[PDB]
Design a protein around this ligand. Structure first.
Ligand SMILES: O=C(O)CNC(=O)C(=O)O
Ligand code: NI
Lengths: 329, 68, 13
């Protein structure tokens, strides 16, 4: 890394205002229908969101006891933005090591904890449940069949991207990116705080973004300096953030922090979701960092729409019979 | 007779053109789908029929797609 | 060695 992170945290130059500050009672499906979820949103307060979080003093070791000491986890080497892997017990030990004793900066942003004890301790905002393609489009009996709590692709019965635990030590940086498949992101600061930089996905900015990835000077160019308008903004403890599809963002951690969030495709900015997928195609992103079963899910979205409106099914007889059985529960 | 949002209508036109024009090896037609082609065709008709949806009447506050 | 999917991570440097 060849740019000075501390000036990027100190400058006033990132003074765009893209974020709408909202009350939770107003974040509903009518709002989504009306606005296309195009705008980043901040809920300073969790009222009317329908969220559920763990005990306020929950710790990384608590997380590890719910997901298992031996669960393998993706960790990010901050310095290089490369990925490594260790067990949650090892991660927990790193995280409990004193600041001055930790040789390297490591971040976890990719612990998906569905089908573990932790999963029922966390609930997203309700409105997400009304629009997430996983819930509303994927054949239910497949989703329900999932037993594996890791992200082993071979055991995966649906796109396992709904509930993530992110655990970050003071000093963590995640460089500019767009979430996989153009997914939208909900993001809840349980303990600590985060600083975000936000760039809107105008055609131009997405062009710069892709060019920047293909150039590999990502440690050299702070992408926010390359664009007309960038907003830097702090999330405090108990805030909830929603990031629309395509939004290019980086994130710094000023204090040890615990965050629960997750990713979701929806029916209201499909064009963007496809744009982002195609950028991953072109820049050759490994499958593992992508949204599982992307096109498969898109096929099921089409089938649902035609079925819910016209009442003609394009599912197999067996799949139709599995859905009837669940309708009768 | 139902009203979608333009967000959706334009989304679903993008999706159908997309999926239709992938080759065999990239199409990823999932296990539960019977006849993709018959699905593509029905989508296109549906979009013709909904092209005239009213923007204010689409704001129902509940999604077109729900489980019963 | 099981292959994974849905790993959240930006590109490397
Ligand atoms: O918190 C971090 O370090 C990075 N998080 C994200 O980019 C995210 O969840 O979308
Ligand atoms: Ni992100």
């Amino acid at each position: 890394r060849t740019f000075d992170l501390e000036e990027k945290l100190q400058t006033n130059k990132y003074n765009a205002n893209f974020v709408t500050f909202m009350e939770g009672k107003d974040f509903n499906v009518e709002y989504i229908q009306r606005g296309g979820l195009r705008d980043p949103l901040i809920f300073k307060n969790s009222d009317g969101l329908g969220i559920k979080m763990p005990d306020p003093d929950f710790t990384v070791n608590d997380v590890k006891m719910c997901v298992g000491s031996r669960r393998m986890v993706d960790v990010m080497d901050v310095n290089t933005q490369k990925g490594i892997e260790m067990t949650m017990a090892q991660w927990t030990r790193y995280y409990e090591t004193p600041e001055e004793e930790r040789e390297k900066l490591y971040n976890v942003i990719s612990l998906e904890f569905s089908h573990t004890r932790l999963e029922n301790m966390v609930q997203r905002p309700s409105t997400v449940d009304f629009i997430d393609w996983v819930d509303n489009m994927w054949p239910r009996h497949l989703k329900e069949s999932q037993t594996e709590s890791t992200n082993a692709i071979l055991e995966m019965q649906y796109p396992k991207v709904q509930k993530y635990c992110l655990m970050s030590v003071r000093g963590c940086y995640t460089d500019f990116h767009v979430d996989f498949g153009g997914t939208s992101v909900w993001y809840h600061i349980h303990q600590g705080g985060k600083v975000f930089w936000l760039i809107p996905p105008t055609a131009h900015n997405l062009e710069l973004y892709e060019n920047w990835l293909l150039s590999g000077k990502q440690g050299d160019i702070f992408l926010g300096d390359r664009v007309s308008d960038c907003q830097r903004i702090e999330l405090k403890q108990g805030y909830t953030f929603v990031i629309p599809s395509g939004w290019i963002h980086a994130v710094y951690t000023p204090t040890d922090t615990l965050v629960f969030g997750g990713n979701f495709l929806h029916s209201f900015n499909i064009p963007m979701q496809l744009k982002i997928y195609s950028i991953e195609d072109r820049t050759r992103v490994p499958n593992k960092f992508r949204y599982p079963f992307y096109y498969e899910m898109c096929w099921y979205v089409l089938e649902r729409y035609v079925y819910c409106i016209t009442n003609r099914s394009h599912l197999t007889k067996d799949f139709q019979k599995e859905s009837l059985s669940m309708d009768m529960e | 007779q139902v009203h979608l949002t333009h967000f959706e209508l334009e989304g679903l036109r993008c999706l159908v053109d997309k999926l239709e024009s992938l080759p065999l090896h990239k199409k990823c037609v999932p296990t539960g789908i019977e006849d993709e082609d018959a699905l593509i065709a029905d989508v296109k008709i549906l979009l013709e029929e909904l092209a005239s949806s009213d923007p204010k009447l689409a704001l129902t506050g509940v999604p077109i797609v729900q489980w019963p | 060695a099981p292959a994974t999917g849905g790993v959240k991570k930006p590109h490397r440097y």
